[PDB]
Design an enzyme around this catalytic site. Structure first.
Site, mmCIF file in Angstrom:
data_model
loop_
_atom_site.group_PDB
_atom_site.id
_atom_site.type_symbol
_atom_site.label_atom_id
_atom_site.label_comp_id
_atom_site.label_asym_id
_atom_site.label_seq_id
_atom_site.Cartn_x
_atom_site.Cartn_y
_atom_site.Cartn_z
ATOM 1 N N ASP A 121 0.669 -1.525 -0.357
ATOM 2 C CA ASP A 121 0.548 -0.329 -0.012
ATOM 3 C C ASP A 121 1.164 1.116 0.196
ATOM 4 O OD1 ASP A 121 -1.764 -2.744 1.120
ATOM 5 O OD2 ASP A 121 -2.970 -0.813 1.349
ATOM 6 N N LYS A 123 0.968 4.736 -1.479
ATOM 7 C CA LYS A 123 -0.065 5.665 -1.769
ATOM 8 C C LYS A 123 -0.224 6.751 -1.567
ATOM 9 C CE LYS A 123 -3.895 2.282 -1.790
ATOM 10 N NZ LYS A 123 -5.174 3.627 -2.523
ATOM 11 N N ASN A 126 -2.400 6.830 1.384
ATOM 12 C CA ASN A 126 -1.573 6.803 2.730
ATOM 13 C C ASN A 126 -0.435 7.119 3.071
ATOM 14 O OD1 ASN A 126 -3.300 4.170 1.375
ATOM 15 N ND2 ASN A 126 -2.215 2.813 2.772
ATOM 16 N N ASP A 139 -1.555 3.333 8.257
ATOM 17 C CA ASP A 139 -2.474 1.318 7.529
ATOM 18 C C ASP A 139 -4.083 2.103 6.566
ATOM 19 O OD1 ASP A 139 -2.713 -0.981 6.756
ATOM 20 O OD2 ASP A 139 -1.295 -1.754 7.787
#
Length: 271
Positions: A121, A123, A126, A139
């Protein structure tokens, strides 16, 4: 032992097919956390693993408990607002700024990949900022998905996709838009897989070298997809002025400092 009644509800941070994330205040300490709530009914690569992996730029899991039918992970909430918010306000960041965030992120992943952990993840959504302007890989999703090509084609989530993650995140901060921000949208599958990613002309030959490296459609050939992993990225031309020891040390000075008094300053909790 923590429990539902130990906290006060503030707002909904994010929902999902896994559950939801809420903003809460521990009534004892008055502190703020983000309570990730998961249905036991719906459902381990996040639990325990991400619970013991401590690190300056990764969000810390303060408490972990369970109700009769849900799993709860209370976590530290950065109060410097989310990057996306900041980036949109400035349209773009200085190649140094990108460089800054990129390095703390690169520090977070060198650490993770060392514990044989693939993030999946990395990106913009986040990414938040703590009260001192330092990055915090959160998260959850606070946007067109940009899964790594090898994820799209072979559902292969190896170390490499975090670099791509970095790449896509760093193509945005400096370029101010995604590699295909215009072109329709249902075309991403074909695009991300078979379309050369074009770079603005206004890019430092190194940044353009970096992005091209973080975006090779071949994980094996990606900057960081090498058996040396992060070294390749830590040692790329774009990252010279980098003191990798200062990074993990929260030593570098944040180039932009969020406007909060103390971590209790709840202003970045609106829009």
């Amino acid at each position: 032992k923590v429990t539902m009644n130990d906290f006060d509800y503030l707002k909904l941070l994010g929902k999902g097919t896994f559950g939801k994330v809420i903003l809460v205040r521990e009534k004892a300490t008055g502190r703020y956390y983000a309570m990730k709530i998961l249905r036991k009914e719906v459902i381990v690569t996040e639990s325990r693993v991400l619970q013991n992996t401590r690190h300056p730029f990764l969000t810390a899991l303060k408490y972990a408990f369970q109700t009769h039918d849900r799993l709860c992970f209370v976590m530290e909430y950065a109060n410097g607002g989310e990057l996306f918010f900041h980036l949109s306000r400035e349209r773009v960041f200085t190649e140094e700024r990108a460089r800054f965030y990129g390095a703390e992120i690169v520090s977070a992943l060198e650490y993770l990949h060392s514990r044989d952990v693939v993030y999946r993840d990395i990106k913009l959504e986040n990414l938040m900022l703590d009260k001192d302007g330092h990055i915090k890989i959160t998260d959850f999703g606070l946007t067109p998905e940009y899964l790594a090509p090898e994820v799209l084609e072979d559902n292969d989530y190896g170390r490499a996709v975090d670099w791509w993650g970095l790449g896509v995140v760093m193509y945005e901060m400096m370029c101010g838009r995604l590699p295909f921000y215009n072109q329709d949208h249902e075309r991403l599958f074909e695009l991300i897989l078979m379309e050369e990613i074009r770079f603005p002309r206004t890019l430092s030959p190194e940044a353009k070298s970096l992005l091209a490296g973080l975006l090779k459609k071949d994980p094996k050939q990606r900057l960081g997809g090498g058996p040396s992993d992060a070294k390749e990225v830590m040692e790329h031309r774009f990252f010279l002025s980098i003191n990798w020891q200062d990074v993990v040390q929260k030593k570098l000075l944040p180039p932009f400092k969020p406007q909060v008094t103390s971590e209790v300053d709840t202003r970045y909790f609106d829009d």
